[PDB]
Design goal:
By secondary structure, this protein is an all-alpha fold. The chain has a single domain, classed as Blc2-like (Apoptosis Regulator Bcl-x, Orthogonal Bundle). Helix content is 76%, strand content 0%. The protein binds the ligand O=C(O)c1c(CCCOc2cccc3ccccc23)c2cccc3c2n1CCC3. There is a cross-link at residues 24, 27 (Glycyl lysine isopeptide (Lys-Gly) (interchain with G-Cter in ubiquitin)).
Length: 152
């Protein structure tokens, strides 16, 4: 994964953590911090929108997932792939994946399984980067992500 993986994990982890706790993290970004911060801002905008519009579906999937513990979270990867790996690859679906990740994170905060949020992010990142790698590189990665949702 290297740089694309590191950057993906940092963005997804910060977004899920921020979404769960309502507090902004204060530590500096590794490399290309400018792009990670821009991607995070983009994610707050479009991701909060997708969580608002897909509330019914997100609730249904979360209920279906019956997440109660570290094992339940550790078990999600094949379900993520089950939905995500079928169909067309586009930024909207990637956003659906991450923003739903945030939704689950908020739910883990509710049941005091916040420790589970970091592996969840690690799991989402692994799913995204491993399965959609060539598509992401082709799209210029997170820079492409930002440019796709740039509101001029
Ligand atoms: O890939 C999609 O278009 C997609 C996605 C994104 C891919 C599947 O994402 C997940 C599926 C299962 C568990 C997940 C846990 C954390 C983050 C994402 C997870 C959806 C997520 C929740 C609900 C729906 C989702 N859809 C479409 C139908 C309704």
């Amino acid at each position: 994964g290297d740089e694309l993986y590191r950057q993906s994990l940092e963005i997804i982890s910060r977004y899920l953590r921020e979404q769960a706790t309502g507090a902004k993290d204060t530590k500096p970004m590794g490399r290309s911090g400018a792009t990670s911060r821009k991607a995070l801002e983009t994610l707050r905008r479009v991701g909060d929108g997708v969580q608002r519009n897909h509330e019914t579906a997100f609730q249904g999937m979360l209920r279906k997932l019956d997440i109660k513990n570290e094992d339940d979270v550790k078990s999600l990867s094949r379900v993520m792939i089950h939905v995500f790996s079928d169909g067309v690859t586009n930024w909207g679906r990637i956003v659906t994946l991450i923003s739903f990740g945030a939704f689950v994170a908020k739910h883990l905060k509710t049941i005091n399984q916040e420790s589970c949020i970091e592996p969840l992010a690690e799991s989402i990142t692994d799913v995204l980067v491993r399965t959609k790698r060539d598509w992401l590189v082709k799209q210029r990665g997170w820079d492409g992500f930002v440019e796709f949702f740039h509101v001029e």
